[PDB]
Design a protein around this nucleic acid. Structure first.
Lengths: 73, 75
DNA sequence: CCTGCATGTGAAAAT
DNA sequence: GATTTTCACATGCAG
């Protein structure tokens, strides 16, 4: 049996499953974000993609505020 | 001159550390700008990504709603 | 005990 | 080539 080794195994695999679910959430997020075109077919590091997320958020907040002022005129 | 094993190892560690510190700083910016994302969640990547996507969707939805309201105020 | 987050490191991609 | 950077991983540990 060895419940200690089973528990060790379960923790290893469940960390890998947490990484998988995190990656799926990240890919869903990034598919809705204006990302730079892959120049030279080179991968874009996560942190570059995260900057694109922040940019898109700020960019659309602004557009909405500009739209709000137009609606108030 | 060729880097020693010890020099290669710690350059490796510092490169990883700096990138994590870079990512974390962006996590904190996302906590700050995403209403429903809480400082307690500032290191839970899964939740950051899901709540960020939700916020993006709502922001675009709001954008649609406003455009239609302007198109309505002009009849 | 369990889990979620933190760490350095192996391996691979990019420079 | 050698180095840097990045990703994924197995693990330690706080709460």
């Amino acid at each position: 049996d060895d419940p200690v080794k089973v528990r060790k195994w379960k923790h290893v695999q469940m960390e890998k499953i947490r990484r998988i679910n995190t990656k799926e959430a990240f890919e869903r997020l990034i598919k809705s974000v204006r990302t730079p075109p892959k120049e030279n077919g080179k991968r874009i590091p996560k942190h570059i993609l995260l900057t694109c997320v922040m940019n898109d958020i700020k960019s659309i907040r602004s557009a909405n505020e500009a739209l709000q002022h137009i609606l108030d005129d | 001159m060729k880097l020693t094993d010890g020099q290669i190892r710690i350059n490796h560690v510092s490169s990883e550390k700096k990138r994590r510190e870079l990512e974390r700083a962006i996590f904190d910016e996302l906590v700050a700008v995403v209403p429903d994302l809480q400082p307690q969640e500032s290191r839970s990547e899964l939740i950051i990504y899901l709540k960020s996507l939700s916020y993006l969707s709502w922001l675009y939805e709001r954008n649609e709603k406003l455009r239609k309201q302007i198109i309505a105020k002009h009849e």
